[model samples]
Target: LTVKSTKQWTIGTDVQGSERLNGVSYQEDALITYGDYQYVTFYETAPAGYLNHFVKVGRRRVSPSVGDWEFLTLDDYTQKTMDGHNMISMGISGDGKIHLSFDHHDVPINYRISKNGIAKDVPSKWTSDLFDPVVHELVGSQGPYSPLTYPRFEPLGNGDLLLEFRIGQSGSGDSYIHRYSASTGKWQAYGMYIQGDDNNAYINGLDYLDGKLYTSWTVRETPNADTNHGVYFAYSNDDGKTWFNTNDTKLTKPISTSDDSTLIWDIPQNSRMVNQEGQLIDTKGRFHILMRDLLSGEHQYQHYLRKADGTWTKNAINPAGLNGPDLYDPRGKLAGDASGEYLFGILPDPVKQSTGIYVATASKDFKDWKSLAEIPNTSTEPLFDKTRLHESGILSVFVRQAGGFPDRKLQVWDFELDL
Candidate 1:
């Protein structure tokens, strides 16, 4: 098969050991494309106990093309300290500066990079009014266990970025929503989203659809023997301000809870998560989600939900199987758009050491499926190319070896429309 390879330039020669099969490696972060450049940021880790650092990799589609991945250090800025704080999420407003999530110990700290494509110590901007700055394990008012769980940036359709996290008061207690307002430079507490008692219920896997946000998480369940234990949801409405109680029996419509629906797909077992990619399209609106089967790891599907009849319906398309794709590795479900209907993401190829970008057409429903023609340069193992795509259609990929600290940093590849 004539496969196309996706490549980008970095600063040094042989600086990243992407070709090594057994030693160390590097990986990139999820990407966001703005005006003239692909703004990128990623972290480096050496499981073998060596060197590691956070780096910035930028690319320009303009003439002479942007240079290779240039390493960014905290020493370049005043507000940052060179601890082991992990950089997780990133974004760019129409203005040019970069937005990112910096994690230290286990706390989700925020940072902003300069437009010049350089790493700094302190954020170009950040909000001090966190809902509750304590640390927690599950969900609560304190801190989130997985701070950057899913979509890192929620665009306001203007120039603002909305950041979400899983917060708890005492590690794994009652959790609520803490929204950061990019426009006002303030973070607000939104706990009213849940419709049940605050102590036992917890929600996660958050995303934005149309003007509102959607999430999937497990709720308190009654002791059952056969099946259908916990509750999972895909919620949305225009009013992003107020939260809705998903368990409101009056508003309940059974997609999986029905007797017939529970046959092919067990209703209570699969926890569904909506994608923030819906923020891109303008017309009617689209919501994409991934539901996992707790009974069997091999069985899973990504669902495309469309708004209709006062509710949403699942698309008819049978998603590509997840048997051997890299998505099964840790976190691998992506629903990002490029042009009109082309949504692209990386699936670990059935062949060892291979990752190919798969493209599927998404409309009111996903009717067509097409695998993109791009693959990362393959060897036995590469550490840098962990991929994530945003609304800009830029695939934020990192290519590194399997067993080493970060050598090559993060980079982005523009969509090859002509392909």
Candidate 2:
């Protein structure tokens, strides 16, 4: 993959005296692209003399050999509070309906969907304001103990939409996955797919691989300490209806609530589970896992590959001395390209104050590592909003750059990869 071109699309303008909630300081899903169009969402103060900031969505057309360059606002969010982060996530159902949810911190939910679920060739049909009235109570009870966080959207190839949300904190609350059927035109909840064990148990990585929903997670006894239980994996071939472990052992649904000793991996206490983007299955049917080793304060990201023969092995992609600046390690996001010849791991530029991503590549077996290039960023804490690797060999990354005094911007960089 090579950076064919780089463009800084403005997410919000910095007007003098009109500056609050301006920084791209939050780590949420901010940028996403589907087919010919790309969307960037952020929170910005209304204008000069205005005290409230609104969540805004912008759209731009992107293609391989494109000629047109335009950015337009699709919609504005007025119900959200000024407290940033917990950004919005957008998804396109199998029928092409646009779905969005954001701005929830243990409070009520915010959600909307397009009126026209069909994907149109015309550009005007893709306007931002073409959405239904927002709904505020997607997940929660009457009590404060059931607050939700980290709402995510996973759009499957079959046009089935899966929405994942966590209802509690690290060790006490539980996480659930709900599916929306385009055929039925309704939503059904899969109660507590990953349950917290009075300890802090939560699902960290959730993805669809080989027609199965894959989830990897870790559990800890407390919220602040690094001491935790082992990392675990489970999958559901029947769309969250049933789950199984790596050994093909049939497990129960709402797996987290029930105790299953077989689900937990026998790893050391120093291991911490990474996010959903760091785990994926390659074309060869092997399960690939990436996580950070938190032993001895050396936060080194370790790579593990489980082959078809039911064997597990680890590769030393980065040594123990290669650590980031914080307690939570700035690990990379692992994505497989179209050809499956290589797996790309995008990491923060630790040497550059975590400004950009270090685009690293490895073979199918997780060998022959190469630090191909760095996607330069402006923020001291660069937030990679969203990234997608299309089958057409176009690698798109949405980035938020916010730092110091005058650095407030959102950019979408496109790369033409040789698949």
Candidate 3:
């Protein structure tokens, strides 16, 4: 089985060169959610000072190809600056309401939520009018946390949504989880599970499956990625209020960079470890993680997983075809189906100065490997519709051309791997 393209389209041009956020792996720059529509958030052209920093939201029906679409420019937030570290994230709650968290790095996080039953309303009724005015406070102005960053949305099994955002600066922040209740129409701060006294945990994700919630991260002692060390894993069987290790032992509160219990792989600092690449856990408790770092004195893509017997396995792959920067490992996205798993990433063209998307495939066991797919012309850190892929078996990816273009074309390409 191989990758097959189903549909492709151009969203629009990049914000007129004030800056671009397409390849920022540290931030979820362009987030897409599949509901009644494939809802997306991005930056657009604004006034002279803001340039390509205007916050915008757009959507189209989930069942159509090249169908009519609608977009709304957030006029109140056009002044938000152009920074790769600050990009908008989109979410659709099961309550038929829309949610957004945007424009925060060192700045205050911007958030908004719509009135009841508006997100799933008919296409003609969807607009900025459905949402309330933007605000900085999610649980209201004076909470325990400070300004937040790296906004994320994870939907729970029972239709609730979990918001994962960080507090503090790089290398020294805490990750907090806030839950949105669909039945009650309220938001509540859960707890800060990942914390550091002097460092930070760059987590791959807070993924919920079956009856448990899982997370994997690497600890960064400083502002640099080279200082990132150790592969850690933890899970909460109690709706993220508590966490535990693979051996069913409860991890100590405030899972820290100094702790030794959660370290799955003891990778050292300055080993060129990549953070937040991707993660996948199947129904049978097979936990898999995809990343790139120094392995046996070489920078190769690493795929590791935990088997049923509790033993761990690692596979490092380096093909001669993807030749770009010698040492820097780019970002990747991981997903899988019944037959095998797939990884999406950006790599430099050996003969040209351009970059393209490379896809690697392996069996469900991750033993067999093949770096088998390629797409050219303007790609960076891949942002895909996770719900679209998981629900419909279509990989809908959003990417732009190489960086620094005044009006680079922003495009979406959908592909399906024959499972």
| Candidate number with greatest TM-score | 3
Candidate 3 least-lDDT 10 residues: 346-355
lDDT of 1 by residue, 1-419 (tens): 11233545432211233222121111112444454334444443323322333333333333135433334433322223333223345555433435554443234444443433222122332222211222223122334334332224444455445554433321232334445443544445444343333222333234554466555444433212122234345444532444343332223221222212111122452233211111122123444443333333443434434343334444322335434422223223344543435544444443444445555654524545455644343222122211123332334444432223244322233443432
For 125-217, candidate 2 gives per-residue lDDT tens digits of 445556676776443322222477767777666777887777876557777777777666566776667666786454545567567777666
> How much is the lDDT of residue 49 in candidate 2?
32
TM-score of each: 0.59, 0.82, 0.89
lDDT of each: 0.36, 0.56, 0.67
Tell me each candidate's RMSD, in Å, in order.
Answer: 9.0, 4.4, 3.0
By lDDT: ranked, best first = 3, 2, 1
- How many residue pairs collide in each prediction? 40, 7, 1
lDDT at residue 299 of model 2 (Cα atoms): 53
The better candidate by lDDT, 1 or 3, is 3
Model 3 misplaced stretches (Cα beyond 4 Å): 4-6, 16-19, 26-33, 49-52, 64-66, 140-142, 324-329, 338-364
Evaluation by TM-score, superior candidate among 1 and 3: 3
Candidate 3, residues 222-253, lDDT tens digits: the string is: 88778888888888887788899878789777
